[PDB]
Design a protein around this nucleic acid. Structure first.
Ligand SMILES: C[C@H](CCC(=O)NCCC[N+](C)(C)C[C@H](O)CS(=O)(=O)O)[C@H]1CC[C@H]2[C@@H]3[C@H](O)C[C@@H]4C[C@H](O)CC[C@]4(C)[C@H]3C[C@H](O)[C@]12C
Ligand SMILES: C[C@H](CCC(=O)NCCC[N+](C)(C)C[C@H](O)CS(=O)(=O)O)[C@H]1CC[C@H]2[C@@H]3[C@H](O)C[C@@H]4C[C@H](O)CC[C@]4(C)[C@H]3C[C@H](O)[C@]12C
Ligand SMILES: C[C@H](CCC(=O)NCCC[N+](C)(C)C[C@H](O)CS(=O)(=O)O)[C@H]1CC[C@H]2[C@@H]3[C@H](O)C[C@@H]4C[C@H](O)CC[C@]4(C)[C@H]3C[C@H](O)[C@]12C
Ligand SMILES: [Mg+2]
Ligand SMILES: [Zn+2]
Ligand SMILES: [Zn+2]
Ligand SMILES: [Zn+2]
Lengths: 79, 72, 50, 99, 102, 1345, 49
DNA sequence: CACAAATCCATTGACAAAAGAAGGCTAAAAGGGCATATTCCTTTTGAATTGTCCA
DNA sequence: TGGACAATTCAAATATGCCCTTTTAGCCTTCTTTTGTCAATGGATTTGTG
């Protein structure tokens, strides 16, 4: 269980962008097979997204950077 | 909360305020009045000694209480 | 057999619940006083006296 | 009592009454304002589209949930289309505009 | 007169709509049928898709089915016989009989 | 998919455009083959198939022919879900008026024709012919013409009349109306004909014509020519098992319409006479109107049973309608409910959910998880598995419950804390174990209260549960930042009893190596749980900027305080637990833990403070027993003395010294006093009664009496409810409120005779009958609030305005009743705060006032801070972050998106539960100007000071000038020293009024000697002295403290002569001695001689109604019954035509257009004269001012501070608390419309009502240009009336009267670009508030780009 | 009802607001276990097919 | 490295069942027409309008 | 002439002729086309084998 999320609301301000960033990160870790950047221990996708937030490495601008790099390297074999 | 417990507070409110009305209807400070402000008869010693400050004699007060009995 | 909560008896005003608890204890005490007489063959000449 | 999915009402495709016919729980007005108080918009959105009344959303959320993908393409709650037809069966033309 | 104000209409359910378990059943049925007809023969699995309602508009009579290969319909029914042959032994049919419950 | 909701009338070609056929027969089904019989109201040909992809007769039944129409019966083969979308239409043989546009608020058919509605209802019922531009040689169009003068006209003009009747009349009339030339002539001849009601009614009608031409409608479209029929599955004809059928009443009303229509078609075909046919059309009218709405017109058609029919308008309108009962308030899958139990072991962030509920709630989850785990091949096999409940499913379940929170919600969701996301713990049994700390937030006790579980399915719903609605993030109420996790009843008693102190218990006097040694002593029986010991404790304090510095010392504490100190975290001081720790002290402990240490440490400390309380209450053995409610000893003597007083007053009533009413009032007062004495006697006897042995001889201490322990700790009870077990339960109040004059002198430990009990049952039933009725008044003030404040949302960061309400502490005569700290805590300063010498700024402008800033402010003790307000905010369409303030469920500033409107509505609605349901109630004069001195009702005399002293009480001092009029007038208090006298004309500076107010005078009447009669020291008076002057002072020993020796005797100073006989009073045959009220210190002692006017002694010396409706009374903005009139304009006032029915009154400025006139009705008192140069927005008379004039005269910062205060008062009265962030947000939505006073240069008329945000953004662009803006006057509305006028119509139609919010919106062609929370909730898309705010923004940016 | 040996005291919060802390002796001794009865009907109707 | 022999790929014929259309049988269901006279039904609350005063 | 005063109106918390005919959709059954189960017939490709 994870009791609080008050650390994320400082890492991703405003506490609503936290929910949106975590929604997208969990869906990205559960729909498209992606490696959690954090040791999973029997824990659902939502909490793993939160823990990734608290390590300061989700940070929606970060997710957008990484997904643009994905689009590029996905369009690298785009010919 | 249990509805007997909201009901209790409602009841003690419903009587505390009524009691404060009926207890404020009685005066004790000294503004010594010696003649019925409605008629002019002298307010006696027993009457003015039961309530220091009664602005009116007994019979005029009863008439007033009746006029209030009809609310207007 | 049950563990009620004493915080209900003052705020609620049912103190008759506490009086019934006391009287029920005493009534059952006379009960177990007989029962420890009926259970050792105690000579009903004494049972009437109690 | 607990219900995941079951029967549904006739005109308004909604769940049924409580524990006699396996009915769902009401999400009244006050219980919507509570979720509006927080920012809980996807909770509220799903609780009045997918869990409740939208039909396509109803049965696609089920498949995406048993296929592990927690996500809904909600759609349009059937009670609103019922109300659209009801207002419209007066002389009132109440459209929905361009997308 | 047994709630706050509830009418007789709140209790009439819609016996037309699917069971949400049932549509998921049907979709997994489609997935299983794709699984089986993907591994089967070219001609055999093809005529099987062509003679039933498999992922297309409604079926054709055995003549209208076999016409695309031009073979006389004894040919196509003779090949669906060995189709059921391949589908008989439980190397391709355990999941399919999984749907068939009793 | 869609962007807005346009609405309008529907043209008959439009209504044909919707249909797929035309209903003709009135038949529905076939009674033997339940196919729908063509072509009635259920008909496969017109309304599509019945069974999926299948003609009716079965010619086609395949997806092959999908799209084909069966040649046999013409039924299209498609889905049967199309039965809910296709419509028909009944080609009426007779035009018929839509009842909505006829019998409504204003009759839209009427004033669009400006024909009185009675005339229309007559011309429609065929009562009268009416001309429709026949020929205007003799007659005009609207002239209603009955049969006699009509046949006259047929004589007069056989032709050129055309005299139509019924609905055909009104349709031909509307087609004959022009709207361009009509609106031109109306506006122009209302400018030419300028009167007061005339031009305003004309401007309403002209606005109607304007709207009609602006939109796309046509006037005749209100008269139906084609009537559409609902699809067949929105009015089902379902079979009930048993041959019965269930039918919508639309099937009945449509069938009635079709019967009447077919009969009329036959009639018109058959050439029936006048009466049969006209009655027929008049009767088809009735069926159309009923099918549109039943009882809006004269009669309500009832059906089979005598209840009335639920027609089309009632399917939308009302709590049983589509909007209220279905669109916002749907039922929900994935949910259940169950009884709740305690579960004292759960962490603050979890709830015990039973296995049998978690297994039926989470079925899809487990099905997918098993198909993944390979434990089941299919979903059917997985269904069988989870149905037979093998062990694998009980492990797959808790695998799916791993991080999945469920929402728990209790019955009346009052505020947002009524729904909270917990994390399940699988439980055997059937009740939902719910934490003890959230029972307060839910308002849940365990008397069988059933709570309800919902499941968040979508991943972002789970993240909103975990990240916003989780229980460990809601530990502060939003209505005020204080915690909501306060330990309630067992925890508080446990902590209290633990952290208390005996005087000589076991182990007293030891010195301990810290707290662990104290605990090892308590669990070993050496020390007592409360035992004064010197323990060394180590407190860490964050003196540094985030550094915990330790400090260790020897504290004089008890074993309990040390044992409980190891549950406190580091940053706290040890002075937080050195006390008995009541519930107030505990809540302060937790609150400052929150403030200093954050949220995670406090969310730990909140349940460690609970586990230890529960444990050390279990250890306490605290019970309650019939020897614990101890009856005082002064009870029987007390009620004896009181009953004797009652007897003597009764006898005096027998003599005729008092009236019945007054003896009753005295009896009530003396019994009330005796009940006060008894409660104080039992309290003083009970609280301290534990006297003990020191080591040592003897001592006294606060008692360990259990009924007092649970009451002093605030855990449960009070000094009042304990009074009814030991003291006496006072005088019982009848349901009217008139108290009964016989008390219940007994208590609950002693019995009660039958009449003493039957008497008390009166109020006991009134109170219960009221709290049982108060349910549906509290949840209705809150609905009004959340609809007026639905569409408000913090939608920017800083408007950048410099304006805010100047918060000063709300003092009432002395120390503040609410300090500046909590009245400015959290709101942001709108100006720099300067030190009281204005040297330099304590705090800069854009400064969120924390606890620390607020106390740095208060230490320098400022009294006025200009903070920003939502009311004076500046954002267009919303509210900026700073102007709202700090948050309250989160410590920090509010995040853009927080739907503060609903938060405010609920913060003001749920404390309404605690408010009452019905209403209830509770140093001289300095002359200014010229004039002579005049008075009346005066009765004075000259004193030994030589002055004039009025013995009278009500006498007034007027300043009358030589003209004879009043120039000044001031109340003259009792016993005033008038330095000047009567009549002498006085100028400024001559204060004829002076006194000493705080000493209530006891001034003399006669002139003679002084003595003391019935005056005794120790019994009736005190032999006191003050050393300031050293001369002894006589204070009457007041009855509340005086001895019972002379308790019934009356001290007094008697006036005598030197010879020793009494000095009578003028005209009274009784002596002149003044009995002295207690606390009157008499200056003059024996032997002295004084004349009149001598103050012989010194005496030491508001009705706020408080019901809940007083809140809704204020929020509705109601004008009171004696509203104080305001000086509408600055400048001097002057009288006019006195009593022109009422008196005339006029205020003329120093320079401006002076003649402002005012009808001041003479029966009411005035407080202005003919020479007062009064200032604007100020009273002339007095009384409850209406809020309109406040906003209109003084300023929008004066309407708020009026509303914000007068409703705060109603909350502090009953003892509630809110933040005034929550009323200023409802004030903003109320005053949210402005009336244009000047068209200016922008596109508004001279008396139009537009939203302030609309009139502001438009002109602000223009003053940004070279052009001018407009000048407006801000209007004001009630929380109901201000909400019915909203931009959206779907937003208004949902809340209040639906048939009017809709029907007006139709003629207006009004569109709806549905932005706002309610409109989006209706249409099943995301909110614009929270996690939906951002999504609505990009959609708002890809809109318009 | 049944009379049982109540004892008024706070016991580890398992009787917190209005809860009750029943012993397992009261379950073993079959004190409060009561019998309920249910009619369930099954009707043989005459469908139109 | 070649001569010979067993199982599949196609038919083909008969023929058997089945349903699609057809022709008749039959209950249902809708018309159609009535001739002593008889001629009228079965709370309280707030406010926005609208007839009725009043200065 | 024009502006207060006071009622009206509306939304919010079980049972009453009938004789006969005629034509229509429902159905009922049987042919006939239309498909589909079985009984054999030659021929590549494969395996048999020295
Ligand atoms: C019942 C209610 C509790 C709500 C739970 C409490 C809280 C506020 C109390 C009133 C105010 O204090 C003002 C006034 C003080 C006088 O001294 C005694 C009378 C008054 C009218 C009080 C009556 C009653 O005591 C009230 C209504
Ligand atoms: C006990 C409950 C009343 C509670 C107050 C009873 C009284 C009669 C019951 C309904 C009727 O049978 C009609 C209908 C039968 C159908 O089959 C489908 C169920 C229906 C809706 C029943 C539901 C419910 O059970 C009812 C309301
Ligand atoms: C009037 C009463 C309200 C409750 C009092 C309601 C409640 C449920 C209703 C009944 C059921 O729906 C179905 C039932 C089917 C039978 O075959 C014949 C009709 C029955 C008796 C219905 C008539 C009636 O409407 C009932 C009695
Ligand atoms: Mg309850
Ligand atoms: Zn008198
Ligand atoms: Zn058909
Ligand atoms: Zn602002």
């Amino acid at each position: 269980a994870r009791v609080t999320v008050q650390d994320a609301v400082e890492k991703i301000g405003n506490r609503f962008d936290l929910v949106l960033v975590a929604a997208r990160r969990a869906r990205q870790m559960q729909v498209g097979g992606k490696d959690p950047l954090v040791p999973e221990e029997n824990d659902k996708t939502t909490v793993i997204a939160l823990r990734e937030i608290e390590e300061g490495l989700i940070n929606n601008q970060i997710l957008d950077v990484r997904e643009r790099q994905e689009q590029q390297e996905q369009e690298a074999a785009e010919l | 909360s249990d509805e007997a417990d909201e009901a209790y507070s409602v009841t003690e409110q419903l009587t505390m305020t009524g009691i404060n009305r009926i207890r404020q209807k009685i005066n004790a400070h000294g503004i010594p009045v010696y003649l019925c402000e409605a008629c002019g008869n002298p307010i006696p010693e027993a009457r003015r000694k039961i309530f220091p400050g009664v602005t009116l004699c007994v019979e005029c007060q009863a008439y007033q209480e009746r006029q209030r009995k009809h609310y207007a | 057999d049950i563990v009620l909560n004493p915080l209900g008896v003052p705020s609620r005003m049912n103190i008759g619940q506490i009086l019934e608890t006391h009287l029920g204890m005493a009534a059952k005490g006379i009960g177990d006083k007989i029962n420890a007489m009926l259970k050792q063959q105690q000579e009903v000449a004494k049972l009437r006296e109690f | 009592h607990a219900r995941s999915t079951g029967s549904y009402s006739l005109v308004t495709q909604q769940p049924l009454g409580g524990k006699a016919q396996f009915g769902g729980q009401r999400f009244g007005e006050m219980e919507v304002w509570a979720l509006e108080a927080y920012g809980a918009a996807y909770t509220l959105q799903e609780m009045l589209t997918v869990k409740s009344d939208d039909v396509n959303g109803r049965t696609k959320m089920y498949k995406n949930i048993v296929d592990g993908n927690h996500q809904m393409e909600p759609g349009m709650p059937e009670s609103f289309n019922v109300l659209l037809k009801e207002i419209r069966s007066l002389g009132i033309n109440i459209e929905l505009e361009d997308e | 007169g047994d709630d706050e104000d509830s009418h007789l209409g709140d209790f009439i359910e819609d016996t037309t709509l699917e069971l949400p378990l049932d549509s998921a059943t049907t979709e997994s049925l489609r997935a299983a049928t794709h699984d089986v007809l993907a591994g089967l023969t070219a001609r055999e699995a093809k005529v099987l898709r062509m003679r039933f309602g498999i992922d297309m508009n409604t079926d054709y009579t055995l003549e209208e089915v076999g016409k695309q290969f031009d073979v006389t319909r004894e040919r196509i029914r003779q090949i669906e016989a060995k189709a059921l042959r391949k589908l008989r032994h439980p190397s391709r049919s355990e999941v399919l009989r999984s749907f068939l419950d009793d | 998919e869609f962007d807005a909701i346009k609405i309008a009338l529907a043209s008959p070609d439009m209504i044909r455009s919707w249909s797929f056929g035309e209903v003709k027969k009135p038949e529905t089904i076939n009674y033997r083959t339940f196919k729908p019989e063509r072509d009635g109201l259920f008909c496969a040909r017109i309304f599509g198939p019945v069974k999926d992809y299948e003609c009716l007769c079965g010619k086609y039944k395949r997806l092959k022919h999908r799209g084909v129409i069966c040649e046999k019966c013409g039924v299209e083969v498609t889905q049967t879900k199309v039965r809910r979308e296709r419509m028909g239409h009944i080609e009426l043989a007779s035009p018929t008026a839509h009842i909505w546009f006829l019998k409504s608020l204003p009759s839209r058919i009427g004033l669009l024709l400006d024909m009185p509605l009675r005339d229309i209802e007559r011309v429609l019922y065929f009562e009268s012919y009416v001309v429709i531009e026949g020929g205007m040689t003799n007659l005009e169009r609207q002239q209603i013409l009955t049969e006699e003068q009509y046949l006259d006209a047929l004589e007069e003009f056989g032709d050129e009349f055309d005299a139509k009747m019924g609905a055909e009349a009104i349709q031909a009339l509307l087609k004959s109306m022009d709207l361009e030339q009509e609106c031109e002539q109306l506006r122009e001849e209302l400018n030419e004909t300028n009167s007061e009601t005339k031009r305003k009614k004309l401007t309403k009608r002209i606005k109607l014509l304007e709207a009609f031409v602006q939109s796309g409608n046509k006037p005749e479209w209100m008269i139906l020519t084609v009537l559409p029929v609902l699809p067949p599955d929105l009015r089902p004809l379902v079979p009930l098992d048993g041959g019965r059928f269930a039918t919508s009443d639309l099937n009945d009303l449509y069938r009635r319409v079709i019967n009447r229509n077919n009969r009329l078609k036959r009639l018109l075909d058959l050439a029936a006479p006048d009466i049969i046919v006209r009655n027929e059309k008049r009767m088809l009218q009735e069926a159309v109107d009923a099918l549109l709405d039943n009882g809006r017109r004269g009669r309500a058609i009832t059906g089979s049973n005598k209840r009335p029919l639920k027609s089309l308008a009632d399917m939308i309108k009302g709590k049983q309608g589509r909007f209220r009962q279905n669109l916002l308030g749907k039922r929900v899958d994935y949910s259940g409910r169950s009884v709740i139990t305690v579960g004292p072991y759960l962490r603050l962030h979890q709830c015990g959910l039973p296995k049998k509920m978690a297994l039926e709630l989470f079925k899809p989850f487990i099905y997918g998880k098993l198909e993944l785990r390979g434990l089941a091949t299919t979903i059917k096999a997985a269904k069988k598995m989870v149905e037979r409940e093998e062990a694998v499913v009980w492990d797959i379940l808790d695998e799916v419950i791993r991080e999945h929170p469920v929402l728990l919600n209790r019955a009346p969701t009052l505020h947002r804390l009524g729904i909270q996301a917990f994390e399940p713990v699988l439980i055997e049994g059937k009740a939902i174990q719910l934490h003890p700390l959230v029972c307060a937030a839910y308002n849940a006790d365990f008397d069988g209260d059933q709570m309800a579980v919902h499941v968040p399915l979508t991943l972002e719903a789970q993240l909103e549960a975990r990240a916003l609605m989780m229980s460990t993030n809601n530990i502060l109420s939003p209505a005020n930042g204080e915690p909501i996790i306060v330990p309630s009843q067992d925890v508080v008693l446990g902590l209290y009893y633990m952290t208390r102190d005996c005087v000589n218990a076991k182990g007293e006097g030891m010195v301990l190596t810290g707290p662990k040694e104290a605990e090892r002593l308590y669990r070993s029986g050496l020390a007592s749980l409360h035992a004064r010991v010197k323990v060394r404790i180590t407190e860490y304090e964050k003196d540094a900027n985030g550094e915990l510095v330790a400090k260790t010392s020897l504290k004089d504490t008890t074993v309990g305080r040390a044992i409980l100190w190891m549950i406190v975290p580091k940053g706290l001081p040890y002075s937080i637990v050195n006390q008995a720790l009541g519930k107030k002290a505990i809540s302060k402990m937790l609150n400052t833990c929150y403030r200093i240490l954050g949220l995670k440490p406090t969310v730990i400390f909140a349940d460690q403070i609970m586990y230890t309380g529960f444990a050390y209450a279990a250890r306490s053995g605290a019970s309650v027993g019939i020897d614990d409610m101890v009856i005082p000893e002064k009870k029987h003597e007390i009620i004896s003395e009181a009953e004797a007083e009652v007897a003597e007053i009764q006898e005096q009533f027998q003599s005729g010294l008092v009236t019945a009413g007054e003896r009753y009032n005295k009896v009530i007062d003396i019994w009330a006093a005796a009940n006060d004495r008894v409660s104080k006697a039992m309290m003083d006897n009970l609280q301290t009664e534990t006297v003990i042995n020191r080591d040592g001889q003897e001592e006294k201490q606060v008692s360990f009496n259990s009924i007092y322990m649970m009451a002093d700790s605030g855990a449960r009870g009070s000094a009042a409810q304990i009074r009814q077990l030991a003291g006496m339960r006072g005088l019982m109040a009848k349901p009217d409120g008139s108290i009964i004059e016989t008390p219940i002198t007994a208590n609950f430990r002693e019995g009660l005779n039958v009449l003493q009990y039957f008497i008390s049952t009166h109020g006991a039933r009134k109170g219960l009958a009221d709290t049982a009725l108060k349910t549906a008044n509290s949840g209705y003030l809150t609905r009004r609030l959340v609809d007026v404040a639905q569409d408000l949302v913090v939608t920017e960061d800083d408007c950048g305005t410099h304006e805010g309400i100047m918060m000063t502490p709300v003092i009432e005569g002395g120390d503040v009743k609410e300090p500046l700290r909590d009245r400015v805590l959290g709101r942001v300063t709108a100006e720099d705060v300067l030190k009281p010498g204005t040297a330099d700024i304590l705090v800069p402008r854009n400064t969120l006032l924390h606890e620390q800033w607020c106390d740095l402010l208060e230490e320098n003790s400022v009294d006025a801070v200009k903070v920003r307000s939502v009311v004076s905010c500046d954002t267009d369409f919303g509210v900026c972050a700073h102007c709202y303030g700090r948050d309250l469920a989160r410590g920090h500033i509010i995040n853009k998106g927080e739907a503060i409107g609903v938060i405010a509505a609920q913060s003001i609605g749920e404390p309404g539960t605690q408010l009452t349901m019905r209403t209830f109630h509770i140093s001289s004069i300095q002359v200014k100007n010229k004039g002579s001195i005049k008075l009346s009702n005066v009765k004075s005399v000259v004193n030994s000071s030589g002055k004039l002293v009025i013995t009278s009480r009500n006498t007034e001092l007027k300043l009358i000038d030589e003209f004879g009029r009043t120039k000044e007038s001031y109340k003259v208090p009792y016993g005033a020293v008038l330095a000047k006298g009567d009549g002498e004309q006085v100028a400024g500076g001559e204060t004829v009024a002076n006194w000493d107010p705080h000493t209530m005078p006891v001034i003399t009447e006669v002139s003679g000697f002084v003595r003391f009669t019935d005056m005794i020291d120790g019994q009736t008076i005190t032999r006191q002295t003050d050393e300031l002057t050293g001369l002894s002072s006589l204070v009457v020993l007041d009855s509340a403290e005086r001895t019972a020796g002379g308790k019934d005797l009356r001290p007094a100073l008697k006036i005598v002569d030197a010879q020793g006989n009494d000095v009578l009073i003028p005209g009274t045959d009784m002596p002149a001695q003044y009995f002295l009220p207690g606390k009157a210190i008499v200056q003059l002692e024996d032997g002295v001689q004084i004349s009149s006017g001598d103050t012989l002694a010194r005496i030491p010396q508001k009705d706020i109604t408080g019901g809940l409706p007083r809140v809704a009374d204020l929020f509705e903005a109601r004008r009171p019954k004696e509203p104080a009139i305001l000086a509408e304009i600055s400048g001097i006032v002057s009288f006019g035509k006195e009593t022109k029915g009422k008196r005339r009154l006029v205020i003329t400025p120093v320079d401006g257009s002076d003649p402002y006139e005012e009808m001041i009705p003479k029966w009411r008192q005035l407080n202005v004269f003919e020479g007062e140069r009064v200032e604007r927005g100020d009273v002339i008379s007095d009384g409850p001012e209406a809020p309109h004039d406040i906003l209109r005269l003084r300023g929008v910062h004066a309407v708020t501070r009026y509303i914000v205060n007068e409703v705060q008062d109603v909350y502090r009265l009953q003892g509630v608390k809110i933040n005034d962030k929550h009323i200023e947000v409802i004030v903003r939505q109320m005053l949210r419309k402005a009336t244009i006073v000047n068209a200016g240069s922008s596109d508004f008329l001279e008396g139009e009502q537009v939203e302030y945000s609309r009139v502001k953004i438009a002109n602000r662009e223009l003053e940004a240009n070279g052009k001018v803006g407009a000048t407006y006057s801000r209007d004001l509305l009630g929380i109901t009336k201000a909400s019915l006028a909203t931009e959206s119509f779907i937003s208004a139609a949902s809340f209040q009267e639906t048939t009017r919010v809709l029907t007006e919106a139709a003629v207006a062609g009004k569109r709806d670009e549905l932005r706002g929370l309610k409109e989006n909730v209706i249409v099943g898309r995301l909110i614009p508030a929270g996690t939906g705010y951002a999504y609505h923004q990009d959609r708002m940016r890809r809109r318009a780009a | 009802g049944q009379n049982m040996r109540v004892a008024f005291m706070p016991w580890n919060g398992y009787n917190f607001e209005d809860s009750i802390l029943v012993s397992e002796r009261v379950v073993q001794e079959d004190r409060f276990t009561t019998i309920h009865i249910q009619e369930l009907a099954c009707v043989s109707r005459d469908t139109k097919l």
